[PDB]
Design a protein around this ligand. Structure first.
Ligand SMILES: [Mg+2]
Length: 214
């Protein structure tokens, strides 16, 4: 029967560095892929506590869980079980840069995610390295087919604790491991929130809702 069930779990591992500080994270998540929501519980397993804002990592922890209207081919779901890769660059307005690569697959009944991230050039006195952030505004990820993959572009807005925001220009390329039907251009509306964290953000739970529309 259907490869992807109405309820699905995942496991994730991230290896990363930000301004040369190495860390690892392991987590697990679950959600309802056709309804477009999911939760994740992440643990810093190496390199904790992190000396920077969790918020730059949160968008790196799951595109199988986007609700898609029936007339827009669901590139992500169609790619399983083999799955898809994605690569991302986030150019923040004060010059920090985060580059990410990710592999998604369906193995032994659950999604498996492997992420590698490199952040550099965050100013030492900036909101990222000083942990002065408080979560992302809703995003519209503009998806368009290009050069045989699905490209997404976002101008993301990170809220500041004091009031105000901090901007990032994001480009992602999502590419199935086997050829799959690409959609036309469309938009994925996304909202991500940290719903729980321990004091030093070595255990973090986050909730995301995502839905495609024309
Ligand atoms: Mg299993």
């Amino acid at each position: 029967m259907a490869i992807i069930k109405e309820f699905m779990r995942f496991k994730v591992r991230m290896e990363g560095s930000v301004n040369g500080h190495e860390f690892e994270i392991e987590g697990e998540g679950e959600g309802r892929p056709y309804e477009g929501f999911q939760t994740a519980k992440l643990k810093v397993t190496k390199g904790g506590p992190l000396p920077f804002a969790w918020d730059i990592l949160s968008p790196q922890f799951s595109k199988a869980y986007v609700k898609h209207p029936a007339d827009i081919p669901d590139y992500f779901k169609l790619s399983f079980p083999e799955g898809f890769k994605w690569e991302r660059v986030m150019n923040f307005e004060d010059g920090g840069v985060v580059t990410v690569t990710q592999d998604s697959s369906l193995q032994d009944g659950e999604f498996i995610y492997k992420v590698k991230l490199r952040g550099t050039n965050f100013p030492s006195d900036g909101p990222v390295m000083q942990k002065k952030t408080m979560g992302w505004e809703a995003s519209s990820e503009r998806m368009y087919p290009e050069d045989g993959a699905l490209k997404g572009e976002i101008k993301m807005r990170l809220k500041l604790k004091d009031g105000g925001h901090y901007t990032s220009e994001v480009k992602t390329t999502y590419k199935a491991k086997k050829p799959v039907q690409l959609p036309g251009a469309y938009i994925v509306g996304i909202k991500l929130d940290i719903t729980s964290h321990n004091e030093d953000y070595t255990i973090v739970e986050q909730y995301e809702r995502a839905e495609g529309r024309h």
